[PDB]
């Protein structure tokens with residue numbers, strides 16, 4: 610009965626996209642369960658799983674996910690292809706990034722123009738991607754223009770908006786903020802990001818809801834789940 614609850618840790622950034630509000634109800638109905646979404650920072654989402662306080666972890670942070678699995682905490686990790694990265698900024702695009710042909714070129718235009726840019730500057734898969742793209746541009750971002758916020762995607766979109774800055778954002782969070790909570794527009798866009806979904810290991814935590822976690826993972830990577838994710 611539901612009241613029977615499965616706990617999933619994720620990031621605040623993934624909650625903002627709104628995917629879970631559409632993806633979870635058919636699973637809840639089919640299994641007579643409630644899926645509690647615990648949206649916290651990336652580090653905390655894994656710490657919750659390391660402590661056995663959730664049954665499933667759903668994050669986009671490849672190195673950290675690998676470690677979680679290597680460390681024995683997570684089992685049966687599956688890729689969940691969803692979402693993509695875009696560069697947003699003021700609608701008058703002073704750096705002229707709309708003329709960029711790749712994301713590395715766009716960022717290098719920013720660094721060269723000295724246009725204000727907000728980094729997530731945290732644990733997140735968005736941060737890792739950003740750093741990978743700076744490295745592919747062969748630039749190491751040092752300036753004043755380069756800001757490291759140490760916050761989630763939502764607060765970074767807000768800070769970019771106040772500062773009339775550019776930022777690298779997942780489209781999902783942007784689409785959810787567009788218009789109401791920013792006036793920034795997509796100036797550069799490109800495939801999908803390999804979220805990882807993982808069950809907390811009941812050999813480490815025998816009270817975790819593993820069988821129900823495994824149903825969730827099967828669901829999300831199954832035809833119904835994929836259709837929702839691709840239609841979203």
Ligand SMILES: [W+6]
Pocket residue numbers: 643
């Ligand atoms: W409730």
Ligand SMILES: [W+6]
Pocket residue numbers: 620622623669733734735
């Ligand atoms: W994230």
